[PDB]
Structure formats: C-alpha cells, structure tokens
Amino acid sequence: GSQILCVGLVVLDVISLVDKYPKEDSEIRCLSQRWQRGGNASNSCTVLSLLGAPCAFMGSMAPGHVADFLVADFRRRGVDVSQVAWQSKGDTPSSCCIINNSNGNRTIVLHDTSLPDVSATDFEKVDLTQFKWIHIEGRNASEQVKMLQRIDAHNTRQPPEQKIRVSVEVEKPREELFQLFGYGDVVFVSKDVAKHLGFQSAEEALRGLYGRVRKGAVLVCAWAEEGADALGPDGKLLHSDAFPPPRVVDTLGAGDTFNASVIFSLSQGRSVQEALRFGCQVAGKKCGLQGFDGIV
Amino acid sequence: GLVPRGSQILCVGLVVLDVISLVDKYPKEDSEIRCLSQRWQRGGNASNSCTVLSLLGAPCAFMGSMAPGHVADFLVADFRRRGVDVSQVAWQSKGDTPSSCCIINNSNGNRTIVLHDTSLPDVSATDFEKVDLTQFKWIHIEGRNASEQVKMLQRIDAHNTRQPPEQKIRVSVEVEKPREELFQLFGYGDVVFVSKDVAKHLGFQSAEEALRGLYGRVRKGAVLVCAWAEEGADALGPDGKLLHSDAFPPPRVVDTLGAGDTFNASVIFSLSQGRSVQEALRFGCQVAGKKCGLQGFDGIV
C-alpha cells in the first residue's frame, strides 16, 4: 500500500499564452504556445509525483500519436500508467486553453470525445492492495459510486491501519455528480459548484453542504485568492489564507495542484489545518509559473 | 526518392496547424466549456496551394519552416495524406511550429482567432541557396519575409540565365498581406498575384483599378493577377489588355476558407500546362468557385 491512485481524465491541453483576453470577433497573435498533458486527475498525478509520492493514473485512453505524447509525459514524471483503460473506439480529448499572461486566468474549450469512460467493470480488475489513497475525479457518477462501494467493501475486511483512504472531486455544476458527496473520507467541492448551488463563500458552502457527506468525512472547498476552508466531524471550520505569487501568470491546473497537495499532506499524516495550508501554498507557487515544474 | 528534372511545382510559405472549435456561446474569460465540434487542419497559403496542386494532378513540393515536434508530425502526415513532397522543409532548432486556435460562435457565425506566435524563423535566403532547383519547373512564393525572398528570387533569376528557354523555371509571387515591405515583391516573377484585401488597402475599389494602378510596379513581361471573389478575376499582361472571367458561384456557399489559394494554385497549374492567361484565369475561377461549395478540398477534383 505505497501508491496513490487518481481516477479521472487525461486530456491534451493545447495552450496559447496571450497578453490580453481576446474580444469576440477579434484576431490577436499569442506570445507563446505549448502542449501540456492535462485532465484533472492527470494534473494531480503530475503534482503528486513532483511532491515525491509514488502514484498511478487510471483513465480512458485511445491509441494514437497524441496518446503517445501523453504516455511519454506520464513516464517522464514516473506516473504509473499500467492501470489505463485503453479503448478501441474514440479519439483522445483535447482542449484549447487560453492563458491570459497579465492575470493568469485560463479559459478552456474542451473537445470531449465519445471516448468511453472508465467503468466499474474496469475498476473491479484493479489490485487495491498497492494503494494507500484513491482519489476519484467525479465524471460518470452512477458508475463511480459502484467503484466506491467496491473500495468500502475492501475496507471492511482490513485493519484500520490498512484502510484505503478515499477522496472525491465534485467540480462541475452537474447534478448526476452530487451523489458522490456522498462517499470518501475527504470531499472536494469547487467554488463553481458551490456558487451554482446558491452559496457565496467557502464557509457558507461548507455549512450548507456538510449534511451530504458520509459520516466522519472532511468537506473541502477552495476559493481562489480567497484561500480555502475545510470542515470535519467536530463542526470546527478551518481556514487557510491563499499564497498568491506576486505575479500570477498561469492558473491552469491550480485546483488540481491544490487537491493533489491536500491529499499528499493528509496521506503523510498531517492535520487538516496543515494540509489546507499546504494545499494553498503549493497551488500558489504553481500560479507564479508556467506548467508544473518548479513547484518543488 | 528520385524526382525527375523539371517535374515539380514548388510553393514556399507558411504551414500552420489550425484548431477550429464551434461553440454555442462565446466563452467568458476564466470559464470551462465544451465545444460542439473541433477540427485540426493544416492551414497556410502555400500549404493550401500545395494541396490543390496535388488534387489537380501536379507533382508538388512545399518549402516552409517547421520545428521538430508533435505539431510538425501532424502537419507532415497531413501533407503526405495530400501527396505533397515535404523533403525541402527547413527544419529549425528554435521556435514553435505555427499553430492557431479559432473559435466559431455557432449562433452568429463570428470568428475569434488566436494567431500563431512569432518565434519560428521564416525560410532564409541561405536555406534557399541549399536547394537544388533542377527538380522544379515552377516556383511560387508566398510573400512574407521580403528582403530574404528577394534574394531567393534573384537566385532563381541567376539560375535561369544559364538555361535554354525550355528549362527555364517559371516564377510566381503572392502579395496578400497589406504590408509595405511586400510591395517590393511586385518587381519579381513572371506571375504576380495581389489580393483583393491588399488592393483595397492601397485604395483601389475593383480588380481593374488595382491592375491598372499597380501594373507599373511589375517587371517587364510579367502578368499581374487579381481575384475579387464573387466579382470574378482579372489579369493584365505586357500587351495592356485587361482580361476577365466571371465567378462560378456554387449551388450554395459552404466554405470559402482557402478559396484564394485554390484560385492561385489553379491559375499556376493551368499556366504550367501551357494554357493561355485567359484560359488560366477561367480555370482558376471554376476550381475556386467549386471549392466554395465544398467543405475543405475533397470535392475540387
């Protein structure tokens, strides 16, 4: 039980760096450009890897030249891809990401391919014994709930010292997902979701959503330059100020850096206060840099 | 492989990877959206003409800059899909292979474009000196980095001086961006293409005005050509006779992107086949008008 597993998407990020966000109808030239391995659970693996945690990626991939780029990137990082659910139909997803360089805002246009989501059937075949932690990026909910009940089962037949710690991300204001709330020892809800649901701050969202989480779970909500808040069984609201870089240049994957960093910290035995902090600290350093290199 | 002497048409210019996304509404900054559809396409003027030359049945070659990497790979594979010879590509050790991102707002047709960056060096006169010209019967140059391209054109002139008339390499030049530096290109080539948009920037309001107003800038004997989309196209050669062909509008207009490059390649191709200027101008209009009723270049034949 030495690895951390993330279950979610891997996506080709085609990045354009501009000095201002383009107005509708305009044509502006970008400052620079790059490809980046993306997808929420994929970025989290990058971050986990850079933090020193052995980790594995599980998601759908279609063979092709793009996949070859993604896979080589996974390996150069030491991310374990042996659990990937290769398809025979569909192309790999890709998105165009515009990063506003004077600002760091990132805007994503995602090309979601018919590519089949990883399934319970797929999950059932995974050797749960190599993993200390399993993080699941919320996508195919009803099918993922199955993957989760699977993990609980496994846990009911192990010492507390050998239970697989579990986390969930609910990032899109998409109702199917809300049942994931739901499962896991640690639950991440995005600002975006929190707002779409009527809440105007992290503390508010935490108080208003805590009723939905499995007993004994920690609800975590990051709120950009507002830092992040967490809330556990004891009813005590935890907060962490953000760590803004003096120059914000690239927020693409900041949330994935935050999740990864909170998980790593927790998986190392630190408190929720400390992990919240580390989360913000690392996310913040990332925002002062292009890509993920240099956060450590 | 072996390319027979004087069999190929060469186009020198930009190739770019265009990423085209159709969306419901224009994305607000800092948001994540799914698109309705997304295409990766090989774009660029000389690039598009190469494709058209291949479908017309001409052996053709592309010369332009690329950096090794995955963008280049997609672009080379697409070049080869269209039977284009890429052996003359100028590989760079610095800069990005050009890529652009376009967003098409489905609910009004608006196009927003983040154009490729500027880091890749254009093809240089020194890169061009390295090319053995004997392969080529026609060399066409998309006007970009002009001072350099002037030397390339002088090098071809030099080459030609020593050739019998039948082994002379025909030359064409395209001026399609409204940039002062390009205007010196008018003085070179047997055939000069000037775009509607450049003509309108110099203040001409029709192909006739443009041809009559610019002819004095081309070299003795050259043919000056200007397409004006739906108004057809004109040509003016040494005999002062303004030639004209009406457009050939398609049943319905589907895709006009690259119509001008289609016109250019078809005019070139026809001339390279020994046809008259009048015939070439007509063919150009027919192929381009056909293209406009098709998506991409598959139908043109």
Ligand SMILES: CSc1nn(-c2ccccc2)c(N)c1C#N
């Ligand atoms: C609380 S984690 C975090 N901090 N920042 C941040 C804070 C200040 C400036 C720039 C980024 C983001 N964008 C985060 C996320 N997710």
Ligand SMILES: CSc1nn(-c2ccccc2)c(N)c1C#N
């Ligand atoms: C003169 S060549 C040409 N024809 N059309 C055309 C003509 C009628 C309807 C639609 C397109 C263009 N857009 C062209 C170019 N360049």
